[PDB]
Symmetry: C2
Subunit: 357 residues, 2 copies
């Protein structure tokens, strides 16, 4: 309870994992209780920032995360407006928030977090305050959300302000984060339910792929538009990995796939090059990563040990300035952006805000 | 001692392998000793049938085996003339035969066995009588050795008979064997030092390839000129496998391979399609073989345990009627055969013999 940035938050998988991470949860908890939630797999995460004045509720922005629920919103890349979420589903979300605002007695700013699994909208939480997304939203929308909510807090309704209709922008605005893993080498550069990033960037595009590509480049990525890609995905992702591989191939990448991931591609008509794990042969990935053999790496994991078992690729990839994704959705966006030219067109905030009708 | 067909013969890998097969070896030895011979790895096997009249030695034929030394002569396919052996080396063997014929006091037929390793002739054994290769060589050379040798035995010299020069036919002759593994399913259809074949066929061609293809077809092989091929080879064969894989590819085959093989092929630039062993996952080889996915199977093993590990490919390949090779040389030969038409041309023996000058 009473924490932001998911402080002391951890995905428990069993008995043990609990005893281990419970005290801590409590220590930061604030004489408030520790919630034990059930983990929604393959869920899309969503952030909603809104303003309620006791009369009305104004929808600031709906942001669809790239990375799935499980990866803190704070370490997630996000899109405004949504890039895959159905209108019907958004509308649902818009309603819930409203419901919440009022029930909550909200006055000023609020931020709501959801999860969309099998077309169902689940409630993650609500921050009865200004969230870290505001600036990004304000910038994307042209609507100085902090001002307004400030005004509201003071007595000047949204109506009196003349701010009542949710703004939907012409272009795509994508936020991407920057992680401090390079400062702390002894740390597993893996993402999760706890927030570890220090900053963020924003990409604006005609297309999601255009916005994404810009945010990525701005995030200081090392991603290349050619080369060899390494694909090492986890069981669940075994199905979509095939389509992502295809895109990479279409793009001119050559592929390598560790045992299990190759088995699947191949069974689908794609034959990657087999690569040996650390404990399998020589050369092994590490050698390969190290050799400046890859330009891209996609690696999904799942389970406390499987994670400590794959820690090496990540450390190496990070260590060798190789662009790497740890989420398949993340890989899909990375791929999509291959079809874009981050240095093609430049626009000003001014122009941006000018396109808004 | 005193056995033919490799009765009770076995390749031993350690002490205990030894203690397990020793008594059996003795039991069949005829109050004669058991030889312990160091195994000759990557060596070519050669058979030589000759007649000695105490005056002169007549070389009937030198047959080079397809399968290497270690696979019983009676279970190996063979070629007359030799198809890979240098003249220089064959000549070395012709002399050894003569030297032996004379020292041993041979009077009539004899059969000599050699192994070629590193351009070095090695003696395996001498069969002081007519051998199983006699009819084939006679048919191949047009010289009725049993008749000639019978006469020599009864008093008539080679000179007198006017059979004094070795015949080297204009065509290739290849012998192939038929194995009974299909009658005894609970058996691992592996080849070895002990003879298990029940019969043989003869293939005659303008080339080694033509000869082999004919031998292979008459041996009732299920081999196809297209399809998917399964490659699963041992460590030593890791070098020549590439060439083999390549050759299958140039022929239009589609490859599948297991882990290790796939690794090597990958390194060569060949990207087979990965296939799961039986302990690896699903579908696996067994499943795929069983499904009729394959038209050719090349599977080589090495060592008691590694043999017993791969037994299932062999047994399934058999049950499902897929052509399989258990030696790389075997595979290479098969490959060659791919470039020929066994149904193309036919020739009577009368006609073959007439082509001899
Ligand atoms: N039930 C759940 N299933 C899957 N993921 C979840 C679940 N609950 C939370 N998460 C993920 O874990 C993150 C952290 O949960 P949360 O309670 O929002 O932490 P927080 O510290 O309050 N964040 P914030 O106030 O925005 O700085 C969410 O952003 C989700 O990505
Ligand atoms: N040292 C060795 N290294 C490699 N292979 C060998 C060696 N000794 C024998 N072999 C193999 O073992 C087989 C059988 O040995 P061999 O002494 O010829 O048995 P055999 O019963 O007398 N045969 P046969 O009289 O021709 O029916 C040979 O054909 C070779 O394949
Ligand atoms: N949005 C967090 C950054 C993504 C990172 N490249 C990874 O795939 O983990
Ligand atoms: N001449 C021996 C038969 C070979 C069999 N196809 C296998 O390679 O074992
Ligand atoms: Cl580039
Ligand atoms: K997320
Ligand atoms: K042999
Ligand atoms: Mn919070
Ligand atoms: Mn949160
Ligand atoms: Mn013998
Ligand atoms: Mn022999």
């Amino acid at each position: 309870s009473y924490v932001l940035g998911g402080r002391a938050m951890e995905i428990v998988y069993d008995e043990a994992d609990l005893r281990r991470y419970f005290q801590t949860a409590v220590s930061v908890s604030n004489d408030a209780p520790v919630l034990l939630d059930h983990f929604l797999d393959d869920a899309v995460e969503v952030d909603v920032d809104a303003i309620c004045d006791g009369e009305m509720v104004l929808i600031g922005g709906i942001m669809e995360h790239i990375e799935q629920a499980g990866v803190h919103s704070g370490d997630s890349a996000c899109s405004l407006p949504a890039y895959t979420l159905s209108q019907e589903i958004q509308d649902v979300m818009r309603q819930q928030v409203q419901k919440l605002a009022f029930e909550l007695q909200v006055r000023g700013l609020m931020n709501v977090q959801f999860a969309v699994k099998n077309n169902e909208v689940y409630l993650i939480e609500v921050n009865p305050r200004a969230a870290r997304t505001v600036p990004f939203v304000s910038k994307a929308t042209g609507v100085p959300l902090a001002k307004v909510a400030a005004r509201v807090m003071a007595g000047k309704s949204l109506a009196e302000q003349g701010v009542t209709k949710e703004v939907i922008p012409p272009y795509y605005s994508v936020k991407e984060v920057v992680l401090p893993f390079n400062k702390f080498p002894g740390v597993d550069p893996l993402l999760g339910p706890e927030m570890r990033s220090t900053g963020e960037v924003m990409g604006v595009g005609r297309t999601f792929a255009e916005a994404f590509a810009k945010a990525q480049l701005g995030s200081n990525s090392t991603m290349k538009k050619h080369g060899r890609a390494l694909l090492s995905v986890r069981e669940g992702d075994k199905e979509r990995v095939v389509d992502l591989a295809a895109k990479l191939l279409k793009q001119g990448f050559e592929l390598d796939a560790t045992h299990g991931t190759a088995i699947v591609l191949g069974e689908a008509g794609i034959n990657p090059r087999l690569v040996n794990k650390v404990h399998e042969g020589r050369p092994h990935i590490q050698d390969r990563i190290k050799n400046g053999e890859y330009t891209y790496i996609i690696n999904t994991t799942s389970g406390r040990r499987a994670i400590e078992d794959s820690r090496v690729i990540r450390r190496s990839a990070l260590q060798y300035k190789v662009h790497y994704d740890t989420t398949l959705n993340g890989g899909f966006a990375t791929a999509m952006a291959l079809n874009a030219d981050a240095t093609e067109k430049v626009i000003s905030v001014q122009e941006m805000h000018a396109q808004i009708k």
